[PDB]
């Protein structure tokens, strides 16, 4: 018992060229039936399956981003020089010292030390509580790959198409030419927590002249610590008959603190299925912010005679149902697809009713029995859902009671207004 739920029939009078713009986290399923222009009853299946985008980025390990606390201390001496004694800030992890050597007058002098031009006033800015807050990587190069499978008549061919490669067969050619990317080289990816949580994108990550407060000021490189300088100047505040204290009118908040303050002003990104090594970082972008340009061309010299002997026979039967026919609940259909006269055959099964088809599922069937699950949403009260191939469907169906990041394009003519609100 078959029903008119076939695929788009395309006569091969001329070559079949196609251009695609695949989103980042999207898998395409384009299938038609190429018709011999010399015989209306000679048709061969053509299936095109393209996977998601795999982003391969050769990166440079920048290290760990450290967060510290600002501290300032002052050290006064009556006689000697500033380069004679030691100070507790000189032994810290990051420290910057500005000393007023031989600048002991009398207005800044304490009640002790009745001398002029003989003392020393050293000021030390150091950072404590250094703790790692995230990991930083720098993009060196980018590479985008997609896995494509074709099914023409009885032939099946798969390949991982790169930017400098194409899946070329005797009749079909699939090329990957362009890629619009959110990421580009010389960018800095910062992961605050683990990888799966995503991260942020920084462009002006300081490398040579880092200051306290800039993104990347304090870094825990594998060679050692890399401390920045300060954004400000020193000054000596003093009163009469008091020890001269040291002031610093500059930036006090660290780079991580300012980043948390204005985190909304930076670019965010997510990752899925991450794989990081000592040289690369592979992941799939789920935000669908990248587009790949794919060119497919099928010549009209298909030789319909060679692709017609012993085609792939497919039988199916609906065996189980679970869910509801309401628009929003969804139902799950189980099909027992039996493939014969072919070792492997790439096609797709649809869950159809008397009128429409509310779901599809692409699967590479093996010679024998195959269990296929199909998800669907919609239907009416008396909708008897069945499993369906191109034209042939199951003998019986089942009835129910009371997105997925896949794209399906089979060229089937959808039902008009007669199937709306019935």
């Amino acid at each position, epitope marked *: 018992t078959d029903t008119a739920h076939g695929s788009g029939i395309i006569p091969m009078r001329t070559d079949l060229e196609l251009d695609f713009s695949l989103p980042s986290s999207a898998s395409y399923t384009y299938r038609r039936q190429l018709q011999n222009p010399a015989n209306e009853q000679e048709k061969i299946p053509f299936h095109l399956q393209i996977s998601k985008q795999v982003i*391969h980025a*050769e990166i440079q390990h920048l290290g760990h981003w450290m967060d510290g606390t600002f501290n300032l201390k002052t050290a006064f001496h009556c006689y000697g020089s500033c380069e004679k004694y030691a100070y507790p800030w000189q032994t810290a992890g990051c420290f910057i010292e500005k000393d007023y050597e031989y600048e002991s007058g009398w207005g800044c002098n304490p009640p002790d030390c009745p001398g002029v031009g003989t003392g020393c006033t050293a000021c030390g800015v150091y950072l404590d509580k250094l703790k790692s807050v995230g990991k930083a990587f*720098k*993009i*060196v*190069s*980018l*590479r985008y790959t997609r896995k494509a499978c074709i099914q023409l008549g009885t032939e099946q061919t798969c390949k991982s198409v790169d*930017s*400098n490669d194409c899946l070329v067969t005797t009749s079909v050619k699939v090329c990957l030419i362009g890629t619009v990317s959110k990421f*580009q*080289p*010389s960018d800095t990816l910062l992961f605050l927590g683990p990888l799966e949580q995503g991260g942020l994108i920084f462009k002006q990550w300081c*490398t*040579t*002249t880092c200051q306290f407060g800039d993104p990347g000021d304090i870094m825990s490189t594998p060679v050692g610590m890399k401390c920045p300088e300060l954004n400000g100047s020193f000054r000596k505040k003093c009163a009469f008959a008091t020890t001269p204290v040291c002031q610093f009118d500059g930036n006090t908040l660290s780079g991580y603190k300012r980043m948390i303050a204005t985190k909304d002003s930076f670019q965010s990104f997510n990752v899925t299925e991450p794989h990081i*090594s*000592a*040289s*690369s970082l592979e992941w799939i972008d789920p935000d669908s912010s990248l587009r790949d340009h794919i060119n497919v061309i099928v010549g009209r010299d298909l030789s319909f005679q060679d692709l017609s002997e012993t085609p792939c026979q497919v039988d199916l039967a609906t065996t189980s149902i679970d869910g509801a026919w309401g628009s929003g609940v969804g139902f799950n259909l189980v099909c027992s697809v039996s493939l014969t006269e072919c070792s492997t055959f790439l096609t797709s099964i649809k869950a159809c009713d008397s009128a429409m088809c509310y779901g599809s599922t692409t699967a590479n069937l093996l010679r024998g029995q195959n269990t296929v699950h199909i998800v669907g949403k919609g239907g009416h009260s008396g909708s008897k859902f069945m499993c369906c191939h191109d034209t042939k469907c199951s003998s019986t169906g089942l009835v129910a009671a009371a997105d997925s990041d896949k794209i399906f394009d089979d060229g089937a003519p959808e039902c008009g207004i007669s199937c709306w609100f019935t």
Partner: antibody
Amino acid sequence: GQVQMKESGGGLVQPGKSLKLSCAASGFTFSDFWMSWVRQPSGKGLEWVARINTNGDTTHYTDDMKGRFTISRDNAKTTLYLEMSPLKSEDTAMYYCTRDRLGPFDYWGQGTTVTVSS
Amino acid sequence: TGDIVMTQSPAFPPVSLGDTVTITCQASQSVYKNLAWYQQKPGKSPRLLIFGMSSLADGVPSRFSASGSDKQYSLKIRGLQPEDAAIYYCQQHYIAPYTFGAGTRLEIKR
């Protein structure tokens, strides 16, 4: 710690004989980077020759040496190889083994001289 | 061949020591950010200077910098020294084949 790469296996060969070049790398994970060979004639510009991936199933060559050059690697000993078919007089140059980062080359070796003369 | 050509202008006039110099590298096609600069000292092996058109390589002094507009890039050196007087190359790696440049040699004026 430090990255160090040394070439070897070069010298003088007859115009029409084979020659295999070796390159030993150390100081980094050899089984995580793409490797590549780049030669340069006497006082001329650089010329990319070949490129190999991590395992060795994907090898890129130039349209000139159609099957003449064969790049291989051994991750157990961290070594790079470049087998060459019967050469010609236009292959006399100095070959460097580089650490290909899918594009730019971030580390170059000392380089060995290959002379093809009679 | 339908490959991209990286025009690197040789024969640069000598410049005094301690000043600022700038070398250009023109492209036959826009590669947008996939540009690397190299340095080959006389007799020694090449050395990666700058990757990603703006990122300094490890072990390169802070007096090096690079930028550029569409298909027109530059490499700036501030505070010249007698050491970094060699030949510089530019390589694009946007689309295959990844081609190199011609080469520009500096000359310190003493």
